[PDB]
Design a protein around this ligand. Structure first.
Ligand SMILES: Nc1ncnc2c1ncn2[C@@H]1O[C@H](COP(=O)(O)OP(=O)(O)O)[C@@H](O)[C@H]1O
Ligand code: SF4
Length: 1046
DNA sequence: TTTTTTTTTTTTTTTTT
């Protein structure tokens, strides 16, 4: 902006800006409906301050409830509300009521709810009173508040007390209760984690019991109303002084899980009780929430505030209970906590700053320039609180690795920060900082940012026609118990028919209700589903209102994933000797060491068994076990397609076991880990499988911790612990590193399968618990999926396997392969694997598609088409033509772009035919895989398959094909456009590679050469395919053979 | 701005200074 003139013209002045705000709000909250009434959500447009009185702060907002931008309702935040950090484009809900007329909310009237759809937990809001930063770091680095002894006691006691209040507080019954709950595997596990004594906990717990009876005798006695405890209790309700008498009648509800779209709060009410307030001779019955605390009788603000928040959660279900109860089981002493407006306001005010802090994580610095990690709420000056924080580690850490001539932050702390982080180097800090950025950006991506509006705002019918909102349903079937919070429930619709679609039994589902007052209820998953009935497992027992009721079921989705990675990252930063080792190997790229073979690298006795195992393996394979055995640090086994990695890992494990090594065996997916286990079962090799037995493969479920427990009836810390030390081999998934076993066990070796598909910080997990490790992967196959552009561009898709692969000394390749026949191999050998793949045998090499009745198959088709149009059909069916590309150029085959994904019905129509034929030629549909680049194209191909009544063949994306193979693969490349649009997907060399490597015997490829050639991987394909004349161009859609398919 | 997706769930609290 130079000349006088630039300035003149650069003067603006409302609409395109309003539009960019609507874009902005949908990056954060996609598809917020906007509204009036109870569940309003207005969109902020403008934010200014003014001055009343003289030096008093007012905040002036301009908001709208629908898209027509003229419905601008003005709004003023006074007193404290004035400083709530709203910027334009934010989604707000005024629960200080109104909508009818927002106007003025201030100290005395109205609540302001910044980002309502984002429900923050009351405990977090309570935490923030003392330290916002502490609360935020808790919410994001969730593992760094490790379970303590008091916390266990506390849970144990909570559970007993709820058990009691349903039943009796009779001492013998209380004893019976505590005695029983002390044996529950959940608690056994935590006793195990903290290496405690079962009986020591029993005792510690037992001393509380008397106080349970003291309380019950005081408040639940049933007798004269004079003779209940007597306290002042000023409600809103008119009259609130002069004492009155309190009588707990019954517990109505325990562990009431609640979500509030209204205040953007979530919470779990320990106990809901029926209460009678006796008042002279009159009585008033109120259902109120009770909070239990096993701590010291502090009556602390935290504690009270928790109750105040519980009163709000409650409104979402029933009348505003106006006040609630704080217990303190230690001493039996119940306190009244009244939900004053000042408190409710003060807290929702604070809960705004928290909702803000958690949502504003990454900073532009220049609207559209590269990302930054936003600083957190600053470090408090109250050294009393800091002193024992738990989150201090990360606070000091996040500080150093994201901070700022200035500082000016309590010099008392500045030093402790350094004490905490001096073990670290500049690269370690940079590494940490960057992975948090990447992870954050991924986490915040629009895919993992969709809200619960569908659940509580649109009714069930409209949503059931897609995704998942099955339900306007009923139960009558008695709830079966299974264990703790897993109760079996049964559902069906009232009266007649009713459908199914995206409800694949085993999903994540949220059970809500007909009306808005019964939203949330219980979350859980699905067992099995007949299209008339449906059975799904939940945490809550739902008997309270039977038959009257109707229930909508919905799904879920990720993002909060980042907690395990952030855990791992943060762990890597800890100053322990393992964490140093991994820093050096991973961040500082320290060269891994190997030793020279010598006679006694293996225990003498092991040697015979090893040799026998070795003998059954090809050279590359044998060379891989040698590397592992000679390693001091790590080993990278490159498992190129069909080279037998499952066979190989099993062999390794068998060798390592022979040598008296303990080994933690991991992978990304259950099936991946299970496949290896199955082999190991065959070899009679013992191992313990952690993880939820329902996700475990069936033949493996006998080895599960969960299963062995129920089976052998394990109800003691010694018998559980005996189980844990039962096997030196332990198998779990990378994410399942949160098991208590890893608080106490370490391994000689960690093995990670699919090491190249797992996101780097996740893969990092199992490594903390093992001396040496082995990543098995292949970087030519798919990487960890990184949705977000900017992150992918910062390197987030680099697997740990790849990262570490620059040390060649540690890389051993698996090349002898047993899947593809000489011809098909040759393809990927020329395109990708630089001639490195060899055939397992002549069997594998020379194998061709099994088609026992080609003869009558060929005739039956010619009963509409011609013999002379042999070009394709003859070449296609020909078993001895294993690789074949079909050019959809000369017959128009246009794509259909539909809100993101692309399809091609012509191509779909075309391949469905080819499928029918191949089954009819004698090839079992079992042995058939269909692949397509685009998810959308899968639908279409699936449809036309039920249309032609052939549905056993599996249509799926390359991804859902990793590591699996079929006898025949057919690929619809679905791209076919004029000379423009050219998606990112086909540019990817790795997705292509996987497609050309799924087939054993016959590989058939289908797309428009014309537009496909402009994708480098495909261009290069077409070259090798032309050289061998394996592309065969098609007739027009008019020709004798095609016309009958269109 | 170009569409590819598995895991872990009691993920809300259990205390303490
Ligand atoms: N050293 C070997 N000798 C003979 N056959 C092998 C060898 N390694 C792998 N195979 C064969 O390769 C096939 C693939 O191995 P497997 O581990 O079952 O699945 P994948 O290799 O696809 O994980 C198996 O049927 C197995 O018989
Ligand atoms: S350590 Fe002190 S500052 Fe850092 S978070 Fe915990 S409380 Fe807030």
């Amino acid at each position: 902006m130079e000349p006088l003139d630039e300035l003149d013209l650069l003067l603006l002045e409302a609409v395109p800006r309003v539009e960019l705000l609507r874009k902005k709000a949908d990056a954060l909250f996609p598809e917020t409906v906007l509204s009036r009434g109870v569940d309003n959500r207005y969109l902020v447009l403008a934010v200014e301050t003014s001055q009343n009185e003289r030096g008093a702060e007012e905040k002036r907002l301009h908001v709208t409830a629908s898209q027509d931008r003229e419905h601008e309702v003005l709004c003023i935040l006074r007193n404290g509300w004035s400083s709530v950090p709203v910027e334009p484009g934010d989604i707000v809900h005024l629960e200080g009521d109104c909508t009818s007329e927002p106007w003025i909310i201030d100290d005395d009237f109205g609540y302001f709810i910044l980002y309502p759809d984002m429900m923050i937990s009351g405990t977090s809001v309570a935490s923030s009173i003392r330290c916002l930063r502490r609360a935020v770091l808790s919410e994001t680095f969730r593992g760094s508040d490790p379970a303590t002894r008091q916390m266990l006691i506390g849970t144990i006691l909570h559970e007993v007390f709820q058990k009691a209040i349903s039943e009796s507080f009779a001492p013998e019954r209380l004893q019976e209760l505590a005695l029983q709950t002390l044996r529950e595997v959940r608690h056994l596990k935590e006793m195990y984690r903290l290496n405690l004594s079962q009986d020591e906990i029993l005792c510690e717990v037992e001393e509380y019991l008397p106080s349970f009876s003291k309380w019950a005798e005081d408040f639940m006695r049933k007798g004269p109303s004079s003779e209940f405890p007597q306290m002042q209790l000023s409600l809103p309700s008119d009259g609130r002084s002069s004492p009155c008498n309190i009588e707990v009648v019954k517990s109505l509800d325990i562990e009431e899980s609640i979500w509030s779209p209204r205040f953007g709060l979530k919470g779990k009410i320990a106990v809901t009780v029926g209460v009678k307030i006796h008042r002279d001779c009159k009585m008033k019955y109120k259902v109120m929430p009770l909070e239990l605390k096993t701590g010291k009788e502090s009556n602390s603000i935290e504690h009270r505030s928790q109750v105040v928040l519980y009163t709000l959660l409650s409104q979402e279900r029933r009348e505003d209970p106006e006040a609630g109860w704080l217990l303190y089981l230690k001493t039996g002493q119940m306190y009244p906590v009244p939900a004053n407006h000042l408190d409710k306001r003060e807290l929702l005010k604070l809960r705004n700053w928290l909702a803000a802090s958690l949502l504003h994580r990454v900073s532009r610095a220049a609207p559209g320039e590269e990302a930054r990690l936003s600083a957190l709420p600053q470090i408090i000056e109250e050294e009393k609180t800091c002193k024992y924080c738990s989150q201090i580690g990360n606070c000091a850490l996040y500080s150093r690795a994201v901070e700022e001539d200035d500082a000016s932050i309590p010099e008392a702390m500045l030093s402790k920060i350094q004490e905490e982080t001096r073990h670290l180097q500049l690269a370690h800090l940079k590494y940490f900082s960057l992975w948090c950025l990447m992870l954050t950006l991924e986490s915040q991506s629009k895919d993992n940012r969709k809200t619960h509006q569908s659940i509580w705002l649109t009714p069930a019918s409209e949503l059931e026609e897609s995704g998942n909102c099955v339900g306007n349903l009923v139960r009558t079937e008695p709830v079966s118990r299974v264990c703790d919070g897993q109760y079996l429930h049964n559902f069906q619709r009232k009266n007649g028919p009713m459908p199914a679609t995206n409800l694949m039994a085993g999903d994540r589902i949220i059970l809500s209700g007909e009306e808005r007052k019964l939203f949330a209820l219980s979350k859980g998953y699905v067992k099995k589903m007949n299209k008339a009935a449906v059975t799904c497992l939940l945490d809550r027992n739902l008997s309270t209102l039977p038959a009257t009721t109707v229930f909508r079921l919905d799904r879920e989705e990720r993002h909060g994933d980042i907690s395990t990675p952030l855990g791992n990252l943060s762990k890597l930063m800890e100053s322990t000797d393992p964490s140093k080792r991994l820093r050096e190997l991973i961040i500082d790229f320290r060269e891994p060491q190997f030793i020279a073979y010598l006679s006694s690298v293996l225990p003498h006795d092991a040697k015979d068994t090893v040799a026998n195992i070795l003998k059954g393996l090809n050279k590359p394979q044998r060379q891989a076990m040698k590397r592992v055995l000679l390693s001091k640090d790590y080993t990278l086994i490159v498992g190129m397609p069909g080279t037998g990695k499952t066979t190989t890992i099993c062999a390794l494990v068998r060798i390592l076991s022979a040598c008296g090594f303990s080994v933690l065996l991991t992978s990304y997916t259950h099936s991946a880990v299970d496949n290896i286990l199955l082999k190991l079962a065959k070899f009679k090799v013992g191992f313990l499988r952690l993880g939820q037995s329902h996700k475990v493969h069936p033949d493996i479920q006998k080895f599960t911790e969960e299963e062995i427990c129920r089976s052998r009836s394990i109800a003691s810390l010694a018998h559980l612990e005996e189980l844990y030390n039962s096997h030196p081999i332990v198998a779990t998934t990378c994410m399942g590193i949160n098991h208590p076993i890893f608080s106490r066990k370490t391994f000689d070796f960690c093995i990670v399968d699919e090491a190249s598909q797992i996101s780097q910080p996740v893969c990092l997990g199992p490594l903390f618990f093992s001396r040496r490790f082995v990543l098995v992967g292949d970087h030519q196959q798919l990487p960890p999926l990184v949705v977000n552009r900017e992150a992918r561009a910062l390197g987030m898709s680099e697997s740990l396997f790849k990262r570490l692969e620059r040390n060649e000394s540690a890389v051993v390749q698996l090349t002898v392969q047993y899947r593809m026949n000489r011809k098909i191999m040759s393809l990927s050998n020329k395109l990708t694997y630089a001639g490195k793949l060899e055939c397992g045998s002549d069997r594998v090499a020379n194998a061709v598609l099994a088609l026992p009745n080609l003869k009558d198959a060929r005739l039956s088709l010619q009963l509409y088409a011609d013999y002379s149009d042999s070009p394709w059909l003859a070449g296609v069916l020909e078993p001895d033509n294993p690789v074949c590309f079909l050019n959809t150029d000369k017959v128009p085959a246009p794509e259909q772009v539909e809100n993101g994904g692309v399809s091609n019905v012509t191509e779909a129509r075309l391949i469905v035919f080819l499928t029918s034929t191949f089954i009819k030629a004698g090839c079992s549909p079992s042995d058939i895989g269909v692949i397509a680049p685009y998810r959308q194209q899968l639908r279409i191909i699936s449809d036309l398959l039920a249309r032609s009544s052939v549905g056993m063949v599996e249509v799926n994306t390359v991804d859902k094909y990793q590591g699996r193979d079929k006898s025949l693969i057919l690929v619809s490349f679905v791209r076919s456009n004029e000379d423009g649009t050219l998606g990112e997907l086909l540019k990817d060399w790795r997705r292509l590679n996987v497609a050309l490597t799924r087939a054993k015997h016959k590989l058939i490829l289908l797309g428009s050469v014309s537009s496909l050639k402009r994708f480098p991987p495909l261009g290069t394909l077409f070259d090798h395919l032309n050289a061998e004349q394996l592309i065969l161009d098609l007739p027009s859609r008019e020709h004798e053979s095609l016309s009958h398919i269109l």
